[PDB]
Structure 1
Amino acid sequence: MQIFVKTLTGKTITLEVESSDTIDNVKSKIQDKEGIPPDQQRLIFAGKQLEDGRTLSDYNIQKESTLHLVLRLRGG
């Protein structure tokens, strides 16, 4: 299935995934496309942060779902 990952910059990333894919595996597809190490990826969907060791289906992520790649910021 096709899902989308939107970054805090507004960039959209299109990924081909399966419901049983692990978050670890989705993050590596993001690393291929964006060059972002999985360690630094914060993925949130429908009020949940996606954790390594779970699958897309554990979070009920569907065809055409949009995930958000978010960041913590150091200013204050």
Structure 2
Amino acid sequence: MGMIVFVRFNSSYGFPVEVDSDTSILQLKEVVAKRQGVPADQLRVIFAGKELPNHLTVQNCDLEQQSIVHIVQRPRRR
């Protein structure tokens, strides 16, 4: 109980985040906004070829135990 999803932000590897079925994408983004000092509205979550919107929750999308997501910043100088 209590799932782990790994979060990769500007790194080659993702850190473990305890989440559950009710955790939303916006909330997950907020863990990174607080770690990087960047606003959550300038962050996006990409998972298994899908950029996931703020309101979706874990039980409402394909995230499962130990999924790894890639959080990127927008806008960001390329």
Asked whether the 8 Å contact 1:3–1:64 carries over to 2, the reply is: yes
TM-score, normalised to structure 2, is 0.76
TM-score, normalised to structure 1, is 0.77
Unaligned runs of 5+ in 2: none
Residue pairs, 1:1-76, within 5 angstroms? 1-71=3-73, 73-75=76-78
CA–CA distance in structure 2, aligned partners of residues 14 and 36 of structure 1: 19
Unaligned runs of 5+ in 1: none
Root-mean-square deviation (Å) = 2.0
**What amino acid sits opposite 2:12 in the alignment?**
G
Aligned pair count? 75
Q: What percentage of aligned pairs have identical amino acids?
A: 33
Asked whether the 8 Å contact 2:5–2:66 carries over to 1, the reply is: yes
CA–CA distance in structure 1, aligned partners of residues 13 and 37 of structure 2: 14
